[PDB]
Amino acid sequence: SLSNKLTLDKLDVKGKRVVMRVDFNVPMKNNQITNNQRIKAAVPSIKFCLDNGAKSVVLMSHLGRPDGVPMPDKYSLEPVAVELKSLLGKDVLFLKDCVGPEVEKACANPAAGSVILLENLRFHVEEEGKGKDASGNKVKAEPAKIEAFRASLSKLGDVYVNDAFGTAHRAHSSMVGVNLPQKAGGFLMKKELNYFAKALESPERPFLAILGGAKVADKIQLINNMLDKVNEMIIGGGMAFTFLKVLNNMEIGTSLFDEEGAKIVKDLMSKAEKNGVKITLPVDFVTADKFDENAKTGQATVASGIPAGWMGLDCGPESSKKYAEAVTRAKQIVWNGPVGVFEWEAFARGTKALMDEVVKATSRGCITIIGGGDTATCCAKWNTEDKVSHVSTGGGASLELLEGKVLPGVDALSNI
Numbered sequence: 001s002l003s004n005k006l007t008l009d010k011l012d013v014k015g016k017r018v019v020m021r022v023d024f025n026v027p028m029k030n031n032q033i034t035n036n037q038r039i040k041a042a043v044p045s046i047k048f049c050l051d052n053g054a055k056s057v058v059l060m061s062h063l064g065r066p067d068g069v070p071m072p073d074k075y076s077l078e079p080v081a082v083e084l085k086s087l088l089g090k091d092v093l094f095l096k097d098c099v100g101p102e103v104e105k106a107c108a109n110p111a112a113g114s115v116i117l118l119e120n121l122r123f124h125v126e127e128e129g130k131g132k133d134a135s136g137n138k139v140k141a142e143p144a145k146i147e148a149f150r151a152s153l154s155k156l157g158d159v160y161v162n163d164a165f166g167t168a169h170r171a172h173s174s175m176v177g178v179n180l181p182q183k184a185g186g187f188l189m190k191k192e193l194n195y196f197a198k199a200l201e202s203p204e205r206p207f208l209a210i211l212g213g214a215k216v217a218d219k220i221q222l223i224n225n226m227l228d229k230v231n232e233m234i235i236g237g238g239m240a241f242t243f244l245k246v247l248n249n250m251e252i253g254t255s256l257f258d259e260e261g262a263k264i265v266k267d268l269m270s271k272a273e274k275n276g277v278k279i280t281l282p283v284d285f286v287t288a289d290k291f292d293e294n295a296k297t298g299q300a301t302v303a304s305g306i307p308a309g310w311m312g313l314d315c316g317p318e319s320s321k322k323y324a325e326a327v328t329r330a331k332q333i334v335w336n337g338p339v340g341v342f343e344w345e346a347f348a349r350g351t352k353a354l355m356d357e358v359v360k361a362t363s364r365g366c367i368t369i370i371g372g373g374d375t376a377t378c379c380a381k382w383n384t385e386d387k388v389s390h391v392s393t394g395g396g397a398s399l400e401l402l403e404g405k406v407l408p409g410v411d412a413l414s415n416i
């Protein structure tokens with residue numbers, strides 16, 4: 001997987017400036033970092049570079065989805081710089097941009113051992129290649145400016161390391177576009193890829209995938225290929241309402257809905273039937289009159305529908321029972337995406353109950369893999385990081401491995 005690729009343990013960094021993509025896309029609440037998992041996970045690679053004599057380590061990441069507009073009031077990485085201090089035992093220089101002559105000067109010839117964190121890559125449309133303007137109109141990036149963006153990032157180091165497993169499914173500029181002669185996979189990239197390579201070679205069966213969360217447009221497009229690998233799927237969280245509206249003609253109110261994915265729902269169900277994959281969808285819900293921690297709440301079922309102006313933000317008790325039945329049958333589980341808005345206590349019961357079931361499954365020998373920026377925060381919140389088989393820093397990235405793909409961030413590394 002990385003067998004063919006240059007990795008950091010084989011990269012001479014002595015006297016070299018290292019430019020490192022990392023996944024510091026950490027969850028935030030009340031403007032605080034709620035889980036430093038993804039930051040801590042990159043420390044081994046950073047520390048290795050500094051201990052083996054790197055002149056500098058320049059760290060670069062996105063945070064959230066600002067869609068190519070500078071929104072430091074809301075998606076700045078400065079809080080991550082602070083947290084990384086503590087985890088490293090080294091101070092960190094935070095720059096307010098990631099490209100341009102001022103950044104290039106700050107990284108051109110740093111004091112020996114400097115750790116530099118750049119501002120959010122996605123404040124530039126050239127990272128993703130597309131985004132929105134500040135008025136919210138979709139925009140494409142211009143090829144020549146994408147090249148200039150990649151050229152600028154490439155000047156910030158002499159060698160490149162990608163340790164950003166959580167983002168490895170994204171063919172973004174900082175992930176596939178850095179032009180330096182040595183492009184090496186970091187130790188987190190190696191740890192995660194090696195874990196999944198073995199867990200996915202010959203899964204214990206039944207193999208259950210649990211797909212929830214809120215990235216519906218993206219992740220509904222992964223189900224088709226996953227249906228060739230798994231024996232059961234829970235489709236919950238925000239993902240479920242697109243399925244229920246199409247299959248059950250359910251009223252879903254203002255719940256998350258994907259117009260494009262709705263067009264393939266019946267094809268996915270046909271393929272699940274063809275491949276013998278049991279699909280478990282929720283049958284009841286905790287509702288809210290608005291997207292707010294303190295919203296008024298209600299209950300609902302698929303038969304009742306969700307009232308107009310209301311949204312389903314958690315599953316209900318009968319859904320938790322059905323989810324639990326699927327977990328009990330499983331011998332291997334991969335779970336990405338909470339089955340409700342677990343950050344808010346009114347909407348956390350379904351995710352907590354499913355966590356309880358997954359922990360119990362682990363205790364009787366199920367191989368249990370939970371991954372994602374927010375889903376791993378469930379493990380931190382309820383203190384189950386040591387009670388499942390593997391907590392991954394990749395969510396969507398892990399689902400694309402489950403599909404059987406080579407991740408773009410891996411593919412772009414140097415061959416041995």
Ligand SMILES: Nc1ncnc2c1ncn2[C@@H]1O[C@H](COP(=O)(O)OP(=O)(O)OP(=O)(O)O)[C@@H](O)[C@H]1O
Nearest residue numbers: 213214215237238313340341372373374375395396
């Ligand atoms: N019914 C729902 N409506 C809206 N949001 C939901 C619902 N159920 C869960 N969520 C939200 O889904 C979010 C997580 O979805 P997401 O797909 O980002 O998962 P993730 O584990 O961070 O995955 P990745 O690592 O790929 O980003 C949480 O913030 C949670 O509030």
Ligand code: NA
Nearest residue numbers: 372373374375
């Ligand atoms: Na997320």
